[PDB]
Design a protein around this ligand. Structure first.
Ligand SMILES: Cc1cn([C@H]2C[C@H](O)[C@@H](COP(=O)(O)OP(=O)(O)O[C@H]3O[C@H](C)[C@@H](N)[C@H](O)[C@H]3O)O2)c(=O)[nH]c1=O
Ligand SMILES: Cc1cn([C@H]2C[C@H](O)[C@@H](COP(=O)(O)OP(=O)(O)O[C@H]3O[C@H](C)[C@@H](N)[C@H](O)[C@H]3O)O2)c(=O)[nH]c1=O
Ligand SMILES: Nc1nc2c(c(=O)[nH]1)N[C@H](CNc1ccc(C(=O)N[C@@H](CCC(=O)O)C(=O)O)cc1)CN2
Ligand SMILES: Nc1nc2c(c(=O)[nH]1)N[C@H](CNc1ccc(C(=O)N[C@@H](CCC(=O)O)C(=O)O)cc1)CN2
Ligand SMILES: [Cl-]
Lengths: 241, 241
């Protein structure tokens, strides 16, 4: 048997992994799996409801990780320090098509800059969303779709990748390969610049609809303007066939 | 006593007028009120439920209307023929500030063109939304508001104008005044042109957000574009404090 550590702050992916273990005898006869959410998760209830434990991977002593054959990050909210990724096999499930729009909310950037979007399972190195790729697949962006629409496709794709590839990766059956290039990276500040709308901006209606749809994601409060009295107004769009 | 005919295709206004009658001794003691919806109303069920009768005022024979002291239009879907307005006292309750943005959906156009918006009770002549004005009041348009937001304010003000003035008009206690200018009439085709978005249109973000809020009104399917594959996509905006 092997011990496996999954660090996730996404209910859907951890639930999915849990369900694969309970329904697949190869998993349950071979693997022990601990699951933890990150200490910086501000709302972890739904994860605590599944019996997960908190972990702070930035302060976790290397020593306490010796048993683990490997570590999986499924939408972990923390950057793994260099010392962790360089001394333990760490594998990340990322909601973007590396190396395009690495970093924050890839589908928001892809709606705007037209680079590929998708899902990627990859080895972690000390950089973000950077290490060698085990599998990935693209998804499309249609004219009517917002962030949340594409994000939902990506999650479904991540589930597919996990189902078809995760056990092979754990069993050293799958061999990864360098990304074709360095790619591009988008930060939280970049997302924040986009959210601060400029009512004076000159552009096509197309460009403005695309900005609003990239920034439309459920109840998240993203895009805003200030009006002539300095009242803050958030803005989202709805597109329907 | 006086016989009054009310032609309305608007559940709220007709219901309000019926409520004032039921609640105000000055009304029940002085008035008999007949109520009809237009023969062209495609979904009159809610009005039929009030026991209202169908009328086609474009075909109605004038001799059949002799008993009426006056006729009130309250969001009537038909243009009254010259013969009717020139031989019966006809009064319209209009959800715009005449003479600005007369005709269709005044508040849509005011969001776009910044002309005043409001409600008006006026005498009907053979032109639309054009006769002498008994009373009217402006409402304002706030940065976060859509068509439906402003429309709701108009309807409320329509109630206040009725409550305060409609009996005075009926009893010849309030004399109307010419509109300040000829003004501008928007047609249905004008509305439909605005709905056909041009994705290549160049404008400020302001401009584009204003066009989309002018066209956002609950579940009506108004603004659309065609994508690359000629799929029709409807667009609404949400603005929120
Ligand atoms: C927080 C936030 C999120 N979103 C949208 C865009 C995101 O793609 C989507 C999901 O975000 P989420 O953070 O709630 O859920 P996850 O996609 O599970 O994100 C998690 O793993 C990611 C790979 C890390 N970068 C995140 O920090 C971490 O929270 O929601 C917004 O549109 N605005 C926001 O403020
Ligand atoms: C039909 C339609 C309406 N709307 C919005 C804008 C309108 O101000 C609002 C309500 O219009 P309505 O037709 O449902 O309801 P009312 O405001 O009662 O309008 C009625 O009296 C008016 C004086 C006439 N011009 C209309 O034909 C007649 O239906 O809803 C749209 O945004 N799109 C639409 O296609
Ligand atoms: N090692 C390493 N750690 C990783 C990944 C990796 O492939 N390599 N992949 C996943 C990436 N998830 C993220 C990426 C960035 C942040 C993040 O929170 N960035 C902060 C600050 C971090 C910093 O720069 O120090 C910011 O943008 O301000 C959080 C989770 C999880 N951790
Ligand atoms: N007499 C006359 N009739 C009226 C009003 C008026 O103050 N004067 N006031 C109300 C106006 N209601 C309308 C206005 C326009 C239409 C309409 O159907 N317009 C068409 C036709 C336009 C036209 O022929 O002028 C269009 O936009 O293309 C229907 C109900 C009720 N009827
Ligand atoms: Cl004039």
């Amino acid at each position: 048997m092997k011990k496996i550590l999954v660090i996730s702050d996404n209910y859907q992916l951890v639930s999915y992994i849990k369900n694969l273990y309970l329904s697949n005898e190869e998993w349950s006869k071979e693997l022990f799996i601990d699951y933890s959410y990150s200490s910086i998760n501000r709302n972890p209830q739904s994860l605590i409801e599944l019996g997960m434990t908190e972990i702070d991977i930035k302060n976790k002593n290397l020593n306490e990780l010796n048993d683990y054959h490997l570590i999986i990050s499924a939408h972990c909210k923390q950057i793994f320090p260099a010392h962790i990724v360089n001394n333990k096999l760490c594998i990340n499930i990322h909601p973007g098509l590396n190396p395009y729009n690495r970093g924050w909310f890839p589908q928001v950037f892809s709606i705007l800059n037209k680079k590929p979007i998708g899902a990627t399972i990859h080895k972690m190195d000390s950089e973000v969303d950077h290490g060698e790729i085990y599998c990935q697949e693209e998804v499309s962006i249609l004219s009517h779709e917002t962030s949340i629409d594409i994000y939902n496709k990506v999650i479904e794709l991540e589930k597919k990748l996990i189902k078809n590839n995760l056990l092979k990766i754990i069993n050293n059956e799958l061999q990864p390969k360098l990304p074709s290039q360095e790619g591009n990276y988008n930060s939280i500040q970049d997302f924040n610049k986009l959210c601060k709308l400029n009512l004076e901006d000159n552009g096509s209606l197309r460009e403005h609809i695309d900005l609003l749809r990239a920034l439309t994601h459920g109840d998240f409060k993203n895009a805003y303007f200030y009006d002539e009295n300095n009242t803050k107004v958030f803005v989202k769009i709805e597109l329907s066939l």
